[PDB]
């Protein structure tokens with residue numbers, strides 16, 4: 895009754911100011927920011 899352990903199961907935060915969405919099928923990398931996290935929402939939101 896509380897989903898909150900999948901958004902942090904596919905994120906590779908790099909100390910070089912980078913990000914690697916570890917989602918299976920995904921292939922987009924971002925930088926030090928909390929925007930890709932919301933991107934993981936559309937990941938398991940409907941697609």
Ligand SMILES: [Zn+2]
Nearest residue numbers: 915917920937
């Ligand atoms: Zn992704």
